[PDB]
Amino acid sequence: APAWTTFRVGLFCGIFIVLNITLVLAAVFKLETDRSIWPLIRIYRGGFLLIEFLFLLGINTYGWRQAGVNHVLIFELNPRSNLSHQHLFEIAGFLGILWCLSLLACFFAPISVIPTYVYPLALYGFMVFFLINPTKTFYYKSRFWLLKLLFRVFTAPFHKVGFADFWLADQLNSLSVILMDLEYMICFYSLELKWDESKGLLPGVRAIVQCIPAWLRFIQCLRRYRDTKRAFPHLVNAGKYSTTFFMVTFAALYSTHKERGHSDTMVFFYLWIVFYIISSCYTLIWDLKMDWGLFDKNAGENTFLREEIVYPQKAYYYCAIIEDVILRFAWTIQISITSTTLLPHSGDIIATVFAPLEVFRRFVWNFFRLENEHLNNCGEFR
Template identity: 40%
Template structure:
């Protein structure tokens, strides 16, 4: 892989502007070579003059890049050092000793047992867990800074080597030895010392002296986020199966075997399939343009779903939905009640979400359930970015809530899966419940806005947004009253006809 592509793949997205502008420097060299090759022989002297100016401009840009990198590295290192000192102070408070490094091994073991023994029934265990997570995040930051250090050093070495090779000069190497080899970002060893100190403190004080356990918590995922070959293979397998099943469904519809009015039972689950697919496209797009959604959504960088995982989930649920539709179509041949297939699909999706076993992306499912729980209890918790983002997503999926409500209503009212029960009844008869379900997404965002106003005391945008979402309530109220009036009027007309 060429270094330019490697740099784009390995850089930390939110620091993108702080890395060496490798491609710009490379373009400067190529432009100079191109200009030299197009000059006629009688203008050689001007070409030489041009290269004197180019050399000055090129090394001026290199100096500017080096200053930028040194400054940013120093800022981030100072920030990490302050954070480390804060965490060491907190750790010292837990152990009752502000000078942790001076504790002997025997005394440390005694103190560790005392702390662990005193955790029962109190909040100390939670405090240690928070400290472990904080050290883990600091360690990730330090490793990213170390990666920043290495990539920029390699970038300067590569571009200056290219300068000498293409222009037949040695000034690039000379500049590299004089400036980059002695640069602060390359020679400063404080970063390595901080990394060692974090590893030591986590091992000794938060992992009971077990280094393997400590490094398990501190482990940093691959920085280039390589997609698993098995995940990609499974996505291809299930996507292919879904396409085949979809063709079979289309053929069955062409033959008149599908009662279209019953397909509404599958609409809610199918929306989930489409949403997962579009979410995968979003994650891929964010990654390509350098948006660090893992940081923004406060997701564990060591355990999270990539776009290939989301594509795989979309394909799997797509296959399950298609199989349910085919089962519904051919239920008589299978001698199974046809209304059992939407129910099985609904239960499968629900079990996947709440299954407490450490399989099927448990960490990601717990994160989603946590955010959904905070969203449903919107007024009682501070609002994080992920909370109001999910609230906005729900506002775009009001029809999905209505479909799942009607699906649940159908099976609660028809527990024996009778063929005679009309699923349209839930849509027509539950006027008040339908109105509440339609208001639910807007209410969640309305409550979040009020909570944000309480916490920040800013009329705009919080009260302004609350007013915007509040307009949904009278809209749905009057729409519900109008539909109810229209229904009564139609009933009266029918009575008069009879």
């Protein structure tokens, strides 16, 4: 990597560190001390999740490069113009600097007479303008590749599913909090704030939006089954993704019936609980048996792992396995809380804590999914 790239990575990291310390101090001492904080870190939560995801994805790229996993060939990339982990760190640091500046501007109202609620819009809009910038200036190859991939993923059944499409769609499952926060931002900027006072910091559709990434992966799996006509690897995981639909709709029904105090609430509660188990198991086993390929028959000397191990220490696997089992359930509940009103008290704390943990779980999942895809042609993308 170029020396200036490493310098910019370090510069962005240092600015981000100092701005995080300043942000913590300003929040502790001089935020409002009485008004509220929740509407602020629910708009900024999605941006923070995106920055964290980019940083962890740079870590993933470094791990794949060191371990010998050919993620360039798996993602169908040219081995001469791809992004290193340095560039991912650089993008994450720059976006984190913008996020910290926007949040500090929200904290420090007397900066100007400009309303506070325009600061989030200046951030996310910039994140759009950076992404869809057609001037061929900043990471134009990678940005155009990502835009094409997003178009293919969101128009899911009408395109052949390569590894990149499935990977991005399955990672949108971990980033669904971003979509929920976008919906919340639309609702807040349509019906909540006053648009004339500094009320950015205050003194049904949601359930359907929660299942959008699961819907994309479900229709992708249906398309894969249609193309390949293999019932086992392409319909079992379709049911795995549909368990998310069932859990979300049962949680929504429970919340709606409990809002009116109906007698059917219980007859739904247990149902949701059952699916809360099934989904949590259905996604978990696929993570450990199909995504990662562990618990193989020909384990050999390695215990509970496969015959071939790419990463230097097998211990990295075992904790990861535990981590997955710990966080998969933590993911599942994090959905039901976010898409419904299951916990009118708390809930925001639970989602705000579990969403970074879900991104971390996806980050850990990437290592071994790519390791499996490299060693054995799992997913059958050739």
